[PDB]
Design a protein around this ligand. Structure first.
Ligand SMILES: Nc1ncnc2c1ncn2[C@@H]1O[C@H](COP(=O)(O)OP(=O)(O)O)[C@@H](O)[C@H]1O
Ligand SMILES: [Mg+2]
Length: 632
């Protein structure tokens, strides 16, 4: 098959096209409600560009995730009839696919937030579309407050807020009782199937269900909800092996992973219809709940888990953890099987577990995460009265205080809670405050050439290639890069030996390093170097004096200091928690007295990820505010 125009005119939103453009015309702020797949993200931009709003400025539309922003900009450029990056483009952290021609721009919420820092009145935009607002992320909640302020100054601007939920009433009341525009649409019955007893391994259960659906259920594609990439990559390998084990007579199952770090060629495959006699299985994360819309899906497999940030209010530390979904999310997952016809949802949990063991809705991200980055962004925009900031769902006053005192000990805020030269310099980088700090400190410590590489290597995933077939051999290849001082300097050694071997792809194959990842680090480095140069921050090498690198790391990650326990593992300096060096660490067979880790990862044990050896003396030297027992 059907032409792009026929596909576009088949969408539920098409029936309300003229009435939608008139509503935008008549109202400064409009709340748009419609079920997922009605065409809000992809058509609202196009309708208003056609109405002529692009003559006044850009039409910007936020997306919560990378794959969402890239996919919708690719589709909309095919529908618009242009090059991707020309009239229609996207902006993600470290990838700006826009140009002087761009009139429709899809960007992550974090990217629009970074634009507010530079231009608080968003004068470049005629229309701001806060999309997928029901997902309620820190960046979305921050953008509501910022745009509430913008709408007052910019009388010419148009603000469209979308929702796939009746949480539109809260958004309407928030935005001066703004009108609500409803896109009616057909929702079909979904047969919800629960397990009689819980499952030991939800991964196994998902695979068994997928094969049972594929072999015994009428045609329709399958959507599987998993928690991350490692888990998705594994599920795909086993499913492929298991399907191969059935023999050549068996009908084809097209196994399609979906996650943030996916090559764009892999991203387009998930939207192609299956050939006749074949079936698709899309193995995705919670991106597939609302952000991505795949046609032909009639079956959903739901293990009931999601990876989400949990916060400790006492210690001020947040962490990504695998927890059950809210009841609202279970309904969203099930609904994906009832978009184009009746479907089935296989819940890999009991009816009792749904009814009792599940929260109605989850707590907004702003009330279950560390606010240091948020507070730093707000202080950089001149927003010092944090109590005066109009949040839709206010974080606890204790959290805003915790966030303030952390930036203080970092040296971003002074005694009067105002930004310092450090804080200002830190705010110029799209990185988390502990990463900014160590980059700005490396300028003073004379190792910014090294820190630019380390910050970049830490901003990429999957640096080392470790196939399931060649695991022992991979580990032998990785050990050749192992530095006595730790993981951060091992990451610098990988990049420098790649650079010295003239950025060779065959060198990467030989050494089991992932060339795509080093090429991404090189790109991030080029961009970070650009900021240093604009702000005249000196780029100096430490030569062989790598202790300077260690001091710089410590100056930013002192909160993550740990001491070796004489019996088992390490005890964190902050809450005296038992933490462990992971078997993949350069320090695994040389565990020092004191370390600093990049992040904590919860698997079987609480593991420290990216560990560097420190002198405990540096804690007093680089974080003196962070101490008690200071007088007689
Ligand atoms: N790359 C893509 N990204 C997003 N949607 C796509 C893509 N390719 C095709 N589509 C189609 O676009 C249609 C319209 O969806 P969309 O505008 O995202 O709706 P809504 O925002 O209301 O959920 C969907 O039916 C989907 O299959
Ligand atoms: Mg959408």
């Amino acid at each position: 098959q059907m032409s792009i125009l026929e596909q576009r005119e088949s969408l539920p939103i098409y029936k309300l096209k003229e009435q939608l453009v008139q509503a935008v015309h008549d109202n400064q702020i409009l709340i748009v409600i419609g079920e997922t797949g009605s065409g809000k993200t992809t058509q609202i931009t196009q309708y208003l560009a056609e109405a002529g709003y692009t003559s006044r400025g850009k039409i910007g539309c936020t997306q919560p995730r990378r794959v969402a922003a890239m996919s919708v900009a690719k589709r909309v450029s095919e529908e618009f009839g242009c090059c991707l990056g020309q009239e229609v483009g996207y902006t993600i952290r470290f990838e700006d696919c826009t140009s002087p021609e761009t009139v429709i721009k899809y960007m992550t919420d974090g990217m629009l937030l970074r634009e507010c820092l530079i231009d608080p009145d968003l004068t470049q935009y005629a229309i701001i579309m806060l999309d997928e607002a029901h997902e309620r992320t820190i960046h979305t909640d921050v953008l509501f407050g910022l745009l509430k302020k913008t709408v007052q100054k910019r009388q010419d601007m148009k603000l469209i807020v979308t929702s796939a939920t009746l949480d539109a009433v809260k958004f309407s009341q928030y935005f001066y009782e703004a009108p609500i525009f409803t896109i009616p649409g057909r929702t079909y019955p979904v047969e919800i199937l629960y397990t009689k007893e819980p499952e030991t391994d939800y991964l196994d259960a998902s695979l068994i269900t997928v094969m049972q659906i594929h072999l015994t259920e009428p045609p329709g594609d399958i959507l599987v909800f998993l928690t991350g990439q490692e888990e998705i990559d594994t599920a795909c390998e086993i499913l492929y092996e298991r399907m191969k084990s059935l023999g050549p007579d068996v009908p084809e199952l097209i196994i399609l992973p979906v996650y943030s770090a996916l090559p764009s060629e892999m991203q387009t495959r998930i939207f192609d219809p299956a050939p006749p006699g074949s079936r698709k299985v899309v193995i995705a994360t919670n991106i597939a709940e609302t952000s991505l819309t795949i046609d032909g899906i009639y079956y959903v497999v739901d293990p009931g888990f999601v990876k989400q940030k949990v916060y400790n209010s006492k210690t001020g530390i947040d962490q990504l953890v695998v927890t059950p979904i809210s009841q609202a999310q279970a309904k969203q997952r099930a609904g994906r099987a009832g978009r184009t016809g009746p479907g089935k949802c296989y819940r890999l949990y009991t009816e009792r577990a749904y009814r009792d063991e599940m929260l109605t809705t989850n707590v907004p991200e702003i009330q279950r995460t560390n606010l240091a980055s948020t507070v730093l962004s707000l202080k950089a925009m001149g927003i010092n009265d944090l109590l005066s900031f109009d949040f839709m769902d206010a974080p606890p006053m204790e959290t805003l205080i915790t966030a303030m005192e952390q930036l203080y000990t970092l040296g971003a805020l002074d005694d009067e809670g105002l930004l310092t030269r450090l804080g200002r310099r830190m705010a110029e980088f799209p990185l988390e405050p502990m990463l900014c700090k160590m980059l700005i400190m490396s300028v003073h410590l004379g190792c910014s050439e090294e820190m630019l590489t380390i910050v970049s290597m830490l901003s990429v995933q999957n640096v080392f290639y470790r196939p399931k077939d060649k695991q022992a051999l991979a580990d032998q290849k990785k050990a050749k890069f192992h530095q006595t001082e730790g993981d951060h300097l091992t990451l610098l050694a990988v990049y420098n030996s790649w650079k010295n071997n003239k950025f060779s792809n065959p060198w990467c194959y030989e050494n089991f390093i992932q060339a795509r990842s080093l090429r991404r680090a090189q790109d991030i480095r080029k961009q970070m170097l650009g900021i240093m140069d604009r702000h005249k921050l000196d780029v100096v090498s430490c030569g062989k004096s790598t202790v300077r690198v260690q001091k710089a790391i410590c100056s930013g990650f002192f909160r993550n200091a740990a001491k070796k326990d004489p019996q088992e593992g390490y005890r964190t300096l902050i809450d005296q928690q038992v933490v462990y060096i992971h078997p993949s660490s350069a320090l695994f067979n040389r565990q020092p007295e004191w370390v600093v880790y990049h992040e904590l990862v919860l698997t079987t044990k609480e593991y420290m990820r990216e560990v560097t050896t420190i002198d405990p003396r540096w804690l007093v030297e680089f974080a003196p505010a962070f101490f008690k027992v200071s007088d007689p």
